[PDB]
Structure 1
Amino acid sequence: ERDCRVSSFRVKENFDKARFSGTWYAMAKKDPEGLFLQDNIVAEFSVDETGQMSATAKGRVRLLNNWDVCADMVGTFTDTEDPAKFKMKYWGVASFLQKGNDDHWIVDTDYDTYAVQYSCRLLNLDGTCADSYSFVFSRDPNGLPPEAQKIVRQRQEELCLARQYRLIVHNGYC
């Protein structure tokens, strides 16, 4: 039935920055092509007097050939007409770690438990994503409540990504 075309994906209606600030732990990930954050991912969202959201993240990264850094990144969110959609310019603090611009959308969150993020880097000629990533976020490093987990799993499904994720560890690494 449902359509996996990016423009169809629903986002978090009336998204609120402030409400969203804080720490978030990465419980599950859907990796994109190439280089990406491995595990122990923690993000920390913030917004300023100007209403511009931002954030720092950190997690193990397995640089080429087993060389495990503990990356520390910085993203800065440029708004869009859609409040749940932003353009995220990121970069690391060291200059060799990866820099980029990524669409960052908030598929759904409840500010206090979970958040589901999605990002489509490259679209297919059919409107579906050719290269995406998704992050399931939890306010508790221990995981989400069965009630929360249930909706999340529903979202993973509407993103045509269910069954593509992978649990993320937080073993102390960073």
Structure 2
Amino acid sequence: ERDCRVSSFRVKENFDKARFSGTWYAMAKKDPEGLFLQDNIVAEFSVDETGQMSATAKGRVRLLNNWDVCADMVGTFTDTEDPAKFKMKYWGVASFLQKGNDDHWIVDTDYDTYAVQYSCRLLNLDGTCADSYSFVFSRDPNGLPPEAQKIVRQRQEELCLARQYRLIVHNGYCD
């Protein structure tokens, strides 16, 4: 009887946007329904004078069975009452023509080794998430330290997404 309601989930307390900046390599992911980033998913976060966070994100996308596309996207993050929860507005500059928006929750991070991202797109009537995606980010693409592995596995299970993540490759397909 685990509480899988989206409102009951806990996020990074006192989230620091400036310390979260820099390169983040997604090593594992949980997919939503429909088309989504496949692999080689690298994120680059930044903060400006005003303190508003922004980021760029590259990644390979399998559109049809015989077409690979290195998506190159830019996004801005709007602040909310919770410092770890944001409203991400994003768009493409290479292939993706349209724009969209999702919630961007930093569930937990130590800023210099790992980070667990979460985003619920659709909510069930009971409060649980009907359609979600999540990323296990890392500063080092070679791997995570032992302590980072333990926290990630714990947070993944607390989000009710145990054994639903798949690993993803970084082989320089998009440079």
TM-score by length of 1: 0.97
- Counterpart contact for 2:40–2:59, Cα < 8 Å: yes
Match of 1:75 in 2: 75
The alpha carbon displacement at 1:120 in A equals 0.1
> Are 1:45 and 1:54, in contact at CA under 8 Å, matched by a contact in 2?
yes
How many residue pairs get aligned? The number is: 174
Deviations 1:9-55 (A, max 9, x none): 00001000001000000010001111110001100000100110000
Q: 1:162: which partner in 2? A: 162
Structure 1 contact 91–99 (Cα < 8 Å) conserved: yes
Could you say what the CA RMSD is over the residues aligned between the two structures, in angstroms? 1.0
Alignment of 1:121 onto 2:131: no
Q: Structure 1 residues 158, 21: CA separation in 2 closer, same or farther (over 3 Å shift)? A: same
Structure 2 contact 52–78 (Cα < 8 Å) conserved: yes
Shift in alpha-carbon separation, 1:44–1:96, aligned structure 2, 3 A: closer
Change (3 A) 1:19 1:98: same
Contact 1:22-1:44 within 8 A present in 2 as well: yes
Gaps of at least 5 residues in structure 1 are: none
Note if contact 1:71-1:97 (Cα within 8 Å) is conserved in structure 2: no
- 1:34-53 aligned within 5 A: 34-53=34-53
Q: CA deviation at 1:143?
A: 1.4
| CA displacement at 1:72 relative to structure 2 | 0.5
User: Is residue 21–residue 44 contact of structure 1 (8 Å, CA) maintained in 2?
Assistant: yes
Question: Any stretches of 5+ residues in structure 2 without a counterpart?
Answer: none
Aligned equivalents of 2:80, 2:95: Cα separation in 1: 28
- What displacement does 1:75 show? 1.2
Q: Please say if residues 72 and 95 of structure 2, whose CA atoms lie closer than 8 Å, have aligned partners that are also in contact.
A: no
State the Cα deviation string for residues 112-145 of structure 1 (Å, max 9, x = none).
1110000000001110000000000000011101
What SS class does the counterpart of residue 40 from structure 1 fall into? strand
Report the Cα offset of residue 63 of structure 1.
1.1
* Cα offsets for 1:78-130 (capped at 9, x unmatched): 01000000000011113644521000000001001110000000001110000
Conservation of the 8 A alpha-carbon contact between 2:71 and 2:95: no
Compare 75-84 and 57-66 and name the one that shifted more.
Answer: 57-66
Runs of 4+ in 1 over 4 A off after TM superposition: none
Match of 1:7, SS?
coil
**Displacement, 1:64?**
2.3
Cα pair 1:107 1:118 within 8 Å, conserved? yes
